[model samples]
Target: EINPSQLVDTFEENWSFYPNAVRTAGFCGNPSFHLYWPNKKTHNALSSRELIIQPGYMMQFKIVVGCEATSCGDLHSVMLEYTKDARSDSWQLVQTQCLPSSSNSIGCSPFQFHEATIYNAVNSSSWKRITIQLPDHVSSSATQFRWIQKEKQSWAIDHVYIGEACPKLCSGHGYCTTGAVCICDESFQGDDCSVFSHELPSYIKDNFESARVTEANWETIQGGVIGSGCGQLAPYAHGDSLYFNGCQIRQAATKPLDLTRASKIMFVLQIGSPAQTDSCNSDLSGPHTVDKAVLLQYSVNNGITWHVIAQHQPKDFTQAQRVSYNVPLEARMKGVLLRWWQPRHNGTGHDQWALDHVEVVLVS
Candidate 1:
């Protein structure tokens, strides 16, 4: 968010707040150009020091312009200028525009006035509010800015705010402690955010005994569930204890799974990669050769986040075999969740895997 006091002068203070104060022509014997329009010469105004704005912070200000009258003449360019770290000689221009000059429109005639603003989101100008987000390339500690007008113009500025900019707010999943640092919820985690989770059951199982299975424990197709093997409508949850196309099974733990004791994930799996169509009829093309994969995933946040635990494919085809994998160390933690991810079978081979009695031994 914008921190107002961070600015050098809001015009509430003397206009001469900076070393290089507001400049103006002698067109009007005004004490400060802020109080009167000098439609004669040009000048520059700036902040006292190079304000240090960290990443994700923004600068904001407002400008009020007035002219002699509806007869105010000539369009001169006015601009906001900035310099990056150690690049004092290199200045970039933003929020640039012609000083309001009109013959039929209102002017600063005391009887008429004009106000414009440049939104902070845009690198342009506005009379009411001017905001500028610090660019990533700009050094936080060596960034400075100033306002510049060519010749013939009259305007006043106010409400300058600098400091922390509008934060990510952690997408409502976390809290901003300082700068871009975020503190996330217990169920969530990440510098930017978090994802995955599940409940630890007695033993994450799916003999495929029933078609109508509760997904809270044993899920289905968590991520990347693309096309079926070759063409078969992607059998998802076939009938028997071991039948599926794309699905995910998650087993929750009382505490993080202890790799030291029980970490074996045993399951019956089958890959229909290069083989007949499960039956004999199959597709005319017969045995097709399309690579297939079954990936195991796990998470600490009840599936709020996921990580690839292991990957496997068929050695041959058509038959189910028993397999086991020892969970990795990185995956060893309290509230651990194990997941089974299978891709769709769309080749000419049997486009499905029969998964039965899956189990996770939790000794610790």
Candidate 2:
């Protein structure tokens, strides 16, 4: 199977070219496949290597057609074709366009060319992006594509992309837009819409909405409880959350989580208000200073030894930020324990924070 990253051909490498086809600087300021008219009237062409594209994929490329100012009055034409199983005689046309002269002297009418600007000029107004969804009959198998220019003119092709319309097809859970991005469904999150909102694989979640820090088999030490009255923090924050009281060091650990198949961990942390009066009686508190930081650690041997994975200062979470960490290969095992440890705070009324939506992504 081909990796998605390798599906694009920028024509930077030496590609196979016939008679009049050459490699030259293109509209993208880089090398591109160029087909120019030769002194003698002959067919010019450029062919791409065999590509194995899956079904339901789309192909896109940028093309610019132009000629010397004098040649603009002559009729020019280009044809895009593809073949299955590398059959030379079975070429089928995908598209064909003609650049008609002022008087239409050739008496031929076809799809008109979009642009007719100079080839190496700094301006790129003539370049046009074209996208085509591959038909199932010609997809999911070995195929080849080529450009044929038989007319007395020049054209350049660059940035050829042949693959899925969107990333993982939006994991089959969302719509693919013209910009090649995914607009995930309401129940899904993530770039590819792979993560379910309520139940993600290998996840350990505790928003404390039930007003209990002990949910999901979590263990708290040194006065950790569910506190409220603070305003919501948007998107991820609503209702109550796991809160810390007093200064000193407080630890909140998840029950031995199986990280054997996990790849990364993500969570949301908010460093709340520092008001000394406790007006809301549930507002989050920022660290007393930069020194009083929060530490995220993991223990693979049942809390006997802890390894610091990440450290966060007050400034890092002033507006409630999402944190992510890659799980080291050595630590991806069963019975792995993770904890958020606050080592030093500014006593009871100040230097407070809350955590919500802890998640561990697994390789599925």
Candidate 3:
């Protein structure tokens, strides 16, 4: 965390307001600022017991649970970012991408974001402390992160608080983000080793849609509400089709977290499904491809394109089928999804893929 007020270079503070670009993060969220000019790369990177933000460090971050593509809904999710170079004015994404209030959670309505997920721990709710190390490779100039305000925030604080334990900065083999919240880095990922989770339902609850029923067809007609995030589609009442399908939200703003450092992606998941089904069961099912799946796919182009990372199908039911997928994300990726997708795999039928609780965690 830094104090945009009392920065190193100037040791002085200046306040100004820009044009029509009103500060958004400051509008509905909290206060923000910027700072540049840190000491060195090795000294500037995130530090602690596990890994350090050495050279070749890159990462991504976001507040959503599933893939970065096709946004679902929202749930009191706010976004932020930071600077890159240890002593420069470069900024990077704080969460995945930016999200609109429409894509926010409804049930959890009216909540503030402190920056942390079931997977990416350590980001304290009470504070925003980021460590942007200098480039490890030589020839690269040394620079400190400069926290610029996307919303023309009237920064109040002057100094920042540096912690003693930064862990693996990039989670070791994991990646380190530029921009400070470092402003830059890869998009969808976590865990360092790049290993992902195979939870039952996709990551719709934690990352995309809401845990509460958001006016779905079944919920409205029946007036029978569902459980928190992924409620069991069982116990369907008379004439009520145990169905659960919601909208996919847009991408978040904070990503390229420091997980690739150790090469592992982490997150939690709870399965949810529609009450009825066809002969087979996949992550998504009944009417669609065997069933919909809570998939983990990736892309090289920003979010314009993508490839499958890992996918989870249904389990437990008589027709319950679970599938696992693995791929190499050692290099940087553009987008990722904690999604409820139905692919044309072995089972090619239309169905509903229930999902909840998803995200890329940093459990170094």
Candidate 4:
């Protein structure tokens, strides 16, 4: 089911074909409703049911003119128009100019245009995606849009989507407004509002509230994963956190930071299943006894080499523990990289551990 204020029609079904317009196999062998000229030049049009256009709404559709080897005559073109009231003849033009280029058109100056041309040897027909923002004056509940074709050619349209457009749909952390902009929530920033914003020279913090690492340039090496589950989420952690499982080496590295004035790195960590869920097996049973530990490391040479700053045994972390480690003087340089390095775990879905609320503090 679709919302009353929005419209989406791929013409796969639920559409009545007019005289010259019919439903046909469209892009990707899917169904699309289209208009074509039969034997004579006549007007053909496809209109939508009444829909409400609110602020920040955008209309998107895919159109193809004479697919493959089909003939798209120079005189053929489609015009898009809209009307507030179907009873009134006051139809306003939505697109008046030709797309791509107007040189392939004939007859109707600047209005009728074909995608391909016989004059150009390389001219070919392909699908074109169009996106348009609804005009402010057309914001009404009785709005109707139509596509009218008047010449001897065929054009198919599919995947019509009309709704609010935002970056990654605001990343589920913000509201979309006019101009496809995102008004992000507090502590969030970026085009999609997916990254945790931090005040420069003060502190860098990532609470993992977005449940994402790549958005903030935090890279996970090997078996590191983010989410909730037996080996994924911490026992007491809220929202989402980063975790590692399996009998393999894993590392989670932060983006290069200007740590010239940074003081310490702080984060919350959890190891083993305190709930006795049997999801995380004992790492001591594995062959690599010395590798069953976590180490905090820093690299000032763009990850070419790393120096261990601190190490912790998995046996010491039955509960979620918060630890703060002083930044080493050698790592207090620009573009320093910090990482939580786990050498090994006990097979798949075993020896689970998690980390959250990673923070890099700067000197006051």
Candidate 5:
């Protein structure tokens, strides 16, 4: 129903803000490139009702892209991350694309968000004002995305506002604090920006009831991919959580991802392999063909189509946690799968594959 109240929210808290000194901190951009701000924990009060998230939300962000653009040094783009489980810091990468090349086009982007952004890319060549809508609480909430371009572009941003469309000055969710703005309980998400990481709810099915952000759950999966890799930790436990853990084989393919919700994903894992400590010692043979890229996958439509959201590359040899990798979730997938490959045929050994901490989030 064409609502007037704009549901706007700021995402500053997601970032660990520090004094803006010469140490390369905070977000900075010029005309050609936009720098990205990492996700932050929730802020003060987290009540969605207080923020007045109307049916139609509106937000305007002014960005200038020019460090290197349209003419062609490096293209400038803006990307976003969405997540639903705030407690787990689930960062789902939204696609990043070129910003408006000129001020006129930038001004119009705010009204039409579903359409692809078209802008001129030149030295201080384009100026854009982006408007985004805040929908009802979604199963997946976007946290943040990178704005900075990789090809050495310069850019600047301003007029970034999250608020109602009209009438309401600001939602009761936030307030003017000691020389700064602060929410009551840090209700993040929506346009209010107030919730925290520990406050988000888990939407896991029984298949992953045991894997709800745990360390012990990783022991098997981590082991299957480490040393010789691709092994099952335990056979399927009847009643629920189907599938077993253990290294079996390795298969390589183009980037895999979740077809249900395609986006870029990031994985940070720490575990003990089949080899020695801190060393990628493998009892398996060298360069054997195994799916080195295992991922945390998912499928929304009853697994008819699968997605591979995260993966691990072929190992060179190292036992480190959170070995980071950003993968696109729109390619071939295995149905919301947590993928990994093995170098050996059937590598076995107790205490060999120990997955300590596995963090699979989103990034653009």
Candidate 6:
């Protein structure tokens, strides 16, 4: 919105309107300005409609400048001017851009439309469109805008808009505009007016078939592997089972789980080596330990303290035999820790031990 203050003649033209001539200024939209320079063709200027825009609103406008294929001679500056209320002698400068010299020596880009978006207040959005949000100080009250053509630049204007806020909303991930739609920022994706994209971890389960230890996923501490070469020694299922010596294997939950909704903890275990130190072996020795049994436990205090949940002896070993037990009352917690322990494995000859196919899930 705008209104022209009409041109005032400084030097009698024509002398009497300059027998020279009055040029019909070329521009876009409905624009009115005061072209009061020496020759009408020498200078041009415009002042916007004196309108009251309340607090925290957006101001948008599209400007076009440039002569067709004609190259310009010197750079012409385009400036945005403003004044608060109707007092104070001078206008404040807001933004400035020098139009390029192109086509018949004129400042512009072959008559192209350039847009400007301004935020009347700080921090805030809506709608589907791209926009530039201003960060500097904004005019408080009695505000008005002016367009000053520096170096006699060719210019045009249109679609002046002022509003308290945008439609819909960009949900903080982007800014809105009336033409180009919503512009998103960084890792956010979705319709500008709604929820965005995110990733979450799934339930925890590890068969340990990858043939490697992922400390974040499994225990890489003192625990290693149990190969298939040792007499009657083989992983419960996959290429191996947890092999430990006085050590324990552990995996912390990547995310919290609702242990209260779960009933039991289960896995397959072959605790302690056979009474006969097998002639067919791997660890360079055999085993014959009655007290080298294993224990299954869980910890809630970041492994600071542990509570036993299940116990096993070599006599209880089986191929894929499953063991199960109700979750202990105090073991129910978020980020629960589970492990396999051999008390005397590191002391005597290899305390025969292997744990495989661990699981923690809901069961009837």
* True-structure RMSD, every candidate: 21.4, 22.6, 16.4, 21.4, 20.6, 26.7
Give the winner by TM-score. 4
Q: Residue 331 in model 2: shift from native, Å?
A: 1.7
Candidate order by decreasing lDDT: 4, 2, 1, 6, 5, 3
lDDT of 5: 0.32
TM-score of each: 0.37, 0.40, 0.27, 0.41, 0.26, 0.35
Query: What is the lDDT for 67 in model 5?
Result: 31
lDDT of 1 by residue, 1-364 (tens): 4212244333343222343344442322223334223444225444335555565665555454443332112244445666754344676653222121223322122211112322221112223444444445444564666655534445555545555643433323444433335556566566633331333344454544454443333443322222233223223323344334322221222223333345677765555434445431122242332223455667554433356655555444345456777767766544456665443344223345445456676455
- Give the 10-residue window scoring lowest on summed lDDT in candidate 6: 119-128
Total residue pair clashes for candidate 1 = 43
- Runs of candidate 5 with Cα error greater than 4 angstroms are 1-54, 72-76, 86-89, 92-113, 116-124, 135-151, 167-364
> What TM-score does candidate 2 reach?
0.40
Off by over 4 Å in 3: 1-139, 142-167, 170-293, 296-309, 312-320, 324-352, 355-364
> Model 6 reaches what TM-score against the true structure?
0.35
Order of candidate numbers by TM-score, starting with the best: 4, 2, 1, 6, 3, 5
Count of steric clashes across candidates, in order: 43, 2, 140, 2, 93, 27
Report the lDDT of model 6 for residue 29: 31
Model 2 agreement with the true structure over 159-244: per-residue lDDT tens digits: 66666667655544454554567677677777866555663225466666764545655854443567652345335667666666
Measured on C-alpha atoms, candidate 6 has an lDDT of 0.42
Local distance difference test, each candidate: 0.43, 0.57, 0.28, 0.59, 0.32, 0.42
What TM-score should be assigned to candidate 1?
0.37
- Best candidate (score: lDDT): 4
In candidate 6, position 242 carries an lDDT of 53
Tens-digit lDDT track for model 6 on 1-364?
4432111221121111112223333233324431222212333555544444444455444444442312222244445666665456466555322111123222122322112222111101111122222213443444566655543334444334443445433444444444435455566555653333553222245555555433345532344454432233334356555544322222122233345556687666654444434412113232533224455667543332346676565555623356788888776644455666543334323445556666777555
Off by over 4 Å in 4: 1-203, 212-214, 230-237, 276-278, 285-287
What's the true lDDT of residue 15 in model 1? 29
